Amino acid sequence: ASAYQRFEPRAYLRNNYAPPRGDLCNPNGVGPWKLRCLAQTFATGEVSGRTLIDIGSGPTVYQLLSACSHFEDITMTDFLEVNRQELGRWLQEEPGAFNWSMYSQHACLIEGKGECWQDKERQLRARVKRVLPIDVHQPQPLGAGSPAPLPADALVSAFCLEAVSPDLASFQRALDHITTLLRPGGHLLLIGALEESWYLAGEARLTVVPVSEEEVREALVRSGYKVRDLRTYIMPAHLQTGVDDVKGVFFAWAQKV
Ligand SMILES: Nc1ncnc2c1ncn2[C@@H]1O[C@H](CSCC[C@H](N)C(=O)O)[C@@H](O)[C@H]1O
Ligand SMILES: O=C1C=C2NC[C@@H](O)C2=CC1=O
């Protein structure tokens, strides 16, 4: 809750998106695995529409790289002001912006359409119309008169819910709250930590509800999704860096019935 007030965006980026976890060179790493699930899913051509919302974007954009070419209106969100400010720095190509080029490249590599990474980042920056505050704990997570087109044709959320939820029940409700933002028939792409109880982000020490793959699936069904795809990545020893206690990472593709 109020722990997210000490959350340092740079430290978080450093902990999860710089080497070793941010080394995209080894295909056996989490970075490549994540981009692969994303890329492969959109490549099916079944996740399509005009609008899309990213839930709890944090200070990261990799989660929209393969997505941006399928939706012309993209909304990014986060609870923290600092995180929206960081997102802004990368969108406006301002100074100090985080460098996502390695990920843009690997997305281009993986997608295999011969695209250059500059055209990818350009497309993303173009299709992201707005960066809105959000709280998944509210029944109306974006608010009343949100500038965001609703309902969205699709949703993306990586490492948010389990990391803002004290327990399974909160998690399930938060899932419910965001699910209302999704048009029926829509698609949800959910990535998150498995069996993780805490992670660091500078002076901030966050509490996490350790969830399992079955608990994630059950939660998706209960929230009213058909689970099209749900995969697990087991965190290798050398990627256990002492910035957290994550055991694995899950990826879910779910369709709203
Ligand atoms: N109550 C809340 N509602 C929505 N998001 C919240 C939230 N409380 C914290 N968050 C955000 O949840 C994010 C989790 S970190 C995830 C960052 C990014 N999605 C990734 O893929 O790395 C944090 O940025 C945090 O600010
Ligand atoms: O909070 C987390 C954020 C992550 N993103 C990459 C993935 O390695 C990861 C694990 C986490 O525990």
UniProtKB/Swiss-Prot annotation:
GO terms for biological process: catecholamine biosynthetic process; epinephrine biosynthetic process; methylation. It catalyses: phenylethanolamine + S-adenosyl-L-methionine = N-methylphenylethanolamine + S-adenosyl-L-homocysteine + H(+); (R)-noradrenaline + S-adenosyl-L-methionine = (R)-adrenaline + S-adenosyl-L-homocysteine + H(+); (R)-normetanephrine + S-adenosyl-L-methionine = (R)-metanephrine + S-adenosyl-L-homocysteine + H(+); (R)-octopamine + S-adenosyl-L-methionine = (R)-synephrine + S-adenosyl-L-homocysteine + H(+). It comes from the Eukaryota. This is Phenylethanolamine N-methyltransferase. Inhibited by methyl methanethiosulfonate, phenylglyoxal, tetranitromethane and diethyl pyrocarbonate. Inhibited by 4-oxo-1,4-dihydro-quinoline-3,7-dicarboxylic acid, 4-(benzo[d][1,3]dioxol-5-ylamino)-4-oxobutanoic acid and 1,4-diaminonaphthalene-2,6-disulfonic acid. Belongs to the class I-like SAM-binding methyltransferase superfamily. NNMT/PNMT/TEMT family. Pathway: Catecholamine biosynthesis; (R)-adrenaline biosynthesis; (R)-adrenaline from (R)-noradrenaline: step 1/1. Changing residue 12 to F: Strongly increases KM for phenylethanolamine and S-adenosyl-L-methionine. GO terms for molecular function: phenylethanolamine N-methyltransferase activity. It comes from Homo sapiens (Human). Disulfide bonds: none annotated. It is an enzyme of class 2 (transferase). Catalyzes the transmethylation of nonepinephrine (noradrenaline) to form epinephrine (adrenaline), using S-adenosyl-L-methionine as the methyl donor. Other substrates include phenylethanolamine and octopamine. Also methylates normetanephrine. Keywords: Catecholamine biosynthesis, Methyltransferase, Phosphoprotein, S-adenosyl-L-methionine, Transferase. The keyword S-adenosyl-L-methionine applies. InterPro entries: NNMT/PNMT/TEMT_CS (IPR025820), NNMT_TEMT_trans (IPR000940), SAM-dep_methyltransferase (IPR053384), SAM-dependent_MTases_sf (IPR029063). S-adenosyl-L-methionine binds at residues 12, 17, 56-57, 62, 78, 83, 135-136, 158. GO terms for cellular component: cytosol. Changing residue 196 to A: Reduced enzyme activity towards phenylethanolamine. Decreases affinity for phenylethanolamine 6-fold. Decreases affinity for S-adenosyl-L-methionine 2-fold. Its EC number is 2.1.1.28. The keyword NAD does not apply. Octopamine binds at residues 196, 244.
